[PDB]
Write a structure and sequence with these properties.
homodimer, about 140 residues, mainly beta, Lipocalin, nine-stranded antiparallel sheet, two-stranded antiparallel ribbon, 2 helices, 12 strands, about 10% helix, globular, binds ligand TCI, lipid binding protein, Fatty Acid Binding Protein Cannabinoid, dimeric, Fatty acid-binding protein, liver
Chain lengths: ~140, ~140
Amino acid sequence: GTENLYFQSMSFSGKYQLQSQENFEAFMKAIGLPEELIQKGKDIKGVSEIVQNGKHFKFTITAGSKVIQNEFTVGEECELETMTGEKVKTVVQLEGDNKLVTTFKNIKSVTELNGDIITNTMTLGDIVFKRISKRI
Amino acid sequence: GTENLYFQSMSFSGKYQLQSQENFEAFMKAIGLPEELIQKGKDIKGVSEIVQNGKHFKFTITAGSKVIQNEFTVGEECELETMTGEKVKTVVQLEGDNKLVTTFKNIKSVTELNGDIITNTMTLGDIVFKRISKRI
Ligand SMILES: CCCCCc1cc(O)c2c(c1)OC(C)(C)[C@@H]1CCC(C)=C[C@@H]21
């Protein structure tokens, strides 16, 4: 026999304007981002978009001077393009009704949606890369 | 708005008779179980029960000379009682259709159901506490 595990989450779909950003320079250096691109995009506060259809997600992230697009299904292994352009395979999971959690290359990524504010925290050792964006 | 995330797993419900057990003493020593209780329950091969109703689990596990009962919902943070009686808060996740995975106090716990055979693997550093039970 089989069991049905049905979940319900807040809609992550929407366009989000980057407002706050912590430890950008430190984090990009740890992952090996060139200093040229670090200073070029450290002050860029762009707009990211999420498209959620059930457990499927489409991410369009404006990070610094780069636009990185990725797609995944919750609970299924996916190939994600990192900030450094390297492609890693990982699984994204839903915690509660508003947290998207994944871990790749010693980076613990947590994306929590609180109302119109979405917070993406990425921890690499002592570095806590925290981004705060608002739905527009 | 809200989104629906539909998952399906094998039914974990049933009573399971412990058959094989490796590194009981080493694991219980690592978590600080008193040596009196370690020798007392190292050879006990009891029966554990799982009650799964969708994404909610009720499991009564016979570990050594202790009967520990806990309840949780997959993806939601819950409070679990450990072997040492300490209560920890963690999140249990479903991997595939037959794996229940969680991590607490540097202990990676994996419970995999392959047909009528259930395998409980708990890794704490170098110690791999492996329990193999059969549904009865
Ligand atoms: C259904 C899986 C969710 C996690 C359940 C989970 C939690 C837990 O309290 C225990 C579980 C596994 O299995 C045994 C082998 C009895 C453990 C022995 C040593 C420790 C620290 C605690 C025991």
